[PDB]
Amino acid sequence: STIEEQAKTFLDKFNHEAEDLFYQSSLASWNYNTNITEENVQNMNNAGDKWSAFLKEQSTLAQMYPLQEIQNLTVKLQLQALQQNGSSVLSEDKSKRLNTILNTMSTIYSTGKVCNPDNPQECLLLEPGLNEIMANSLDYNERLWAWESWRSEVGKQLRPLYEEYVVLKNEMARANHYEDYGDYWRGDYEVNGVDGYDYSRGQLIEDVEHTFEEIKPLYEHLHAYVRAKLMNAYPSYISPIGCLPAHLLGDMWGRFWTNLYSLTVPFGQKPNIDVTDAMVDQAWDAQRIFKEAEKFFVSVGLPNMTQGFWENSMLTDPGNVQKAVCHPTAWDLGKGDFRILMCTKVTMDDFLTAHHEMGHIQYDMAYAAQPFLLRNGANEGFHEAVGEIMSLSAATPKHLKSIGLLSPDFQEDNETEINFLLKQALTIVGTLPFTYMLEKWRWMVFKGEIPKDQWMKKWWEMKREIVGVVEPVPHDETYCDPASLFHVSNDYSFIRYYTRTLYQFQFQEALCQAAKHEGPLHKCDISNSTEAGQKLFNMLRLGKSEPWTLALENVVGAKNMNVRPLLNYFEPLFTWLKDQNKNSFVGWSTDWSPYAD
Amino acid sequence: CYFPLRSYSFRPTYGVGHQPYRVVVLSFELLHAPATVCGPKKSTNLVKN
Structure with missing residues (x-):
């Protein structure tokens, strides 16, 4: 009789x-x-527009439902989700211009052609040799060209193409009664209809900046450590008072610090812990890595999954006779069928991601009784953030004594844990102001703050502010630096990587308290604990059917993101970085430039 | 105003919760008529003398 029953x-x-x-x-x-194959690529044209036709024919009926008289919480979220129309709010010729520009952004990233005019006999790409050359470039001019030519010829023709992209995406939000395209990513995060737990539209500028000051000494002891250990490699390049060039960070951008480590190691006499040479003498295959990972979930209290997982799914690549993309993306097929396609060897990081990839699937079982648009994480970024917290507990030396990958007699002194806490802070802790830097570039260009000549003027000025990086090559207004990134042109959310640290280390404090662990947080393990398993089980069965600001108080008892459990993880490393950094110069200088001669 | 009957989708590859399961139950009741269908519970060997 009412709108709620309709x-x-x-x-x-x-x-x-x-x-x-x-x-x-x-x-x-x-x-x-x-x-x-040739047969399934025309099935991507056949079945790919069946999702595209179905979502706009259900948005043909449902936009005339008002949101004002809806009493229940669930229906409102589900309906906002149904209503936001995306790219269909334009006219005819403006939408078909938007459809053909995204096909040109994806094909220019992988198939993009740049090589050397001094010797153009043989050229390279982004996936092949490139990796090998970068890996080893202790030189100076050999790694200077590989960063600059990757920026210059790729972003030459894309920079007039992004002049049309910034004006067209401002028509997305104003038809959806929002302000800009940068706040389209944070439109998922809003919670309305609750008393006191409500989320405003100016809070994410406020909450991240208040947590930025407390992590400002956290990066600064890591910033002086990279300058101190590179003094033997490069004498004349890195200044002690000045800043770092961008292309010495061991990556095409500097998002991953995992390569430069082959230099920044504290102790070369004490070796790094590896299970790779241990598992090859005991004759193990790729099946037994997930047989030992399956017994990890039954000791924490999680139930066994379905019996059709092992027989219909494949792991080892069946020869060179067919082409397979082995890239590790988690697959949710719907209706109880959960499969996986990976690229497998016997290595130590395949065992590290095995509790990450099974962390997706064991969360994917529990919300299967929920309706389909509420089948998600708690926010949009909980789906890839669920696996690394139990992957950190599987990388502990205490858990490996029970499952027997290590020796039964192993001595761990105070300099053994320095190598473990530095390597885990490379791709997690140390990328947090680098995640913050281009996102504040992302919101302020869509509000109409800067003109055309201020587009790259704001770029290197902020880069010597937040992360303290001055670029060695001065750039023109004909070059675009963010355009070479995977998460820009392919239209993905880069906002998930900032809260990747702030969800998991906050949730590590609540789970290790209920499991009764006495010590630092890197020695904690969730196995052989049924007390923290039922705390986890109330979180896994919700999704975004329960709102995310009401799901934090069920676990940690706090309504916001806190810095203090991450500093407790940093606390044995905080003493060791204080003793080393006394001879060096704290902070960095603004006026230092590499190209001033 | 919507059509009440909804379709099934059948596929062997779903797994344990989404497979179909054919269910028939037996209903027993008492009435004025005497009891009709009774039970075999195996029989012993016939002996003499």
């Missing part, structure tokens, strides 16, 4: 109808990365 009948029609069409096109899409 809203449940439309969405329960929408529930089982979307279970059929999502599983039908993802069965060929699981065969897409399995087999590269």
Whole structure:
């Protein structure tokens, strides 16, 4: 009789109808990365627009539902989700211009052609040799060209193409009654209809900046450590008072610090811990890595999954006779079928990601009784952040004594844990102001703050402010530096990587308290504890059906992001970085430039 | 105003919760008629004398 009884009948029609069409096109899409064929690539044209036709025909009926008289919380979120129309709010010729520009952004990233005019006999790409050359470039001019030519010829033709991209995406938000395209990523995070737990639209500028000051000494002891250990490699290049060039960070951008480590190691006499040479003498295969990982979930209290996982899914690559994309993306096919396609060897980081990839699937079982648009994480970034917290407990030396990958007699002194806490802070802790830097570039260009000549003027001025990096080559207004990144042109959310640290180390404090661990947080293990397993089990069965600001108080008892459990993880490393950094110069200088001669 | 009957989607590759399971139950009741269908519980060997 009411609007609430009319809203449940439309969405329960929408529930089982979307279970059929999502599983039908993802069965060929699981065969897409399995087999590269001529037959299945025209099935991507056949079944790929079946998702595109279904979402706009259900947005043809449902935009006339008001959100004002809806009493229940669940329906509102589900309906906002149904209503936001995306790219269909334009006219005819403006939408088809937007459809053909995204096909040109994806093909220019991988197939992009740049090599050397001094000797153009043989050229390189972004996936092959490139990796090998970068890996080893103790030189100076050999690594200087590989960063500059990757920026210059790729972003030459994309920079007039991004002049049309900034004006067209401002028409996305104003038809959706928002302000800019930079706040389209944070439109998922809003919670309305609750008393006192409500989330405003100016809070994410406020909450991140208050946590930025407390992590400002956290990066600064890591900033002086990279300058101190590179003094023997480069005498004349890195200044002690000045800043760092960008291309010495061991990556095409500097998002990953995991390569430069082959230099920044504290102790070369004490070796790094590796399970790779240990598992090859005991005759293990790729199946037994997930047999030992399956017994990790039954000791924490999580139930056993379905019996059809092992027989219909593949792991080892079946020869060179067919082409497979082995890239580790987690697959949710819908209707109880959860598969995986990985690239497997016997290595120490394949065992590290095995509790990450099974962390996705064991979360994916529990929300299967929920309706389909509420099948997600707690926010949009919980789906890839769920696996690394139990992957950190599997990388502990205490857990490996029980499952027997290490020796039964192992001596761990105070200099053994310096190598473990530095390597885990490379791709997690040390990228947090680098995640913050281009996102504040992302929100302020869409509000109309800067003109055309101030576009790259704001770029290197902020880079010597937040992370303290001055670029060695001065740039023109014909070059675009962010354009070479994977998360820019392919339209992905880069906002998940800032909260990757702040969700997991906050949740590590609540789970190790209920498991009763006495010591530092890097020696904690969640196994053989049934007390913290039922605390985890109330979190895994929700999704975004429960709002994310009400799901934090069920676990940690706090309504916000706190810095203090990450500093407790940093606390044995905080004493060791204080003793080393006394001879060096703290902070960095603004006026130092490499190209001033 | 919506059509009440909703379709099934059948595929062997789902797994344990989404497979179909055919369920028939037996209903027993008492009425004025005497009891009709009774039970075999195996029989012993016939002996003499």
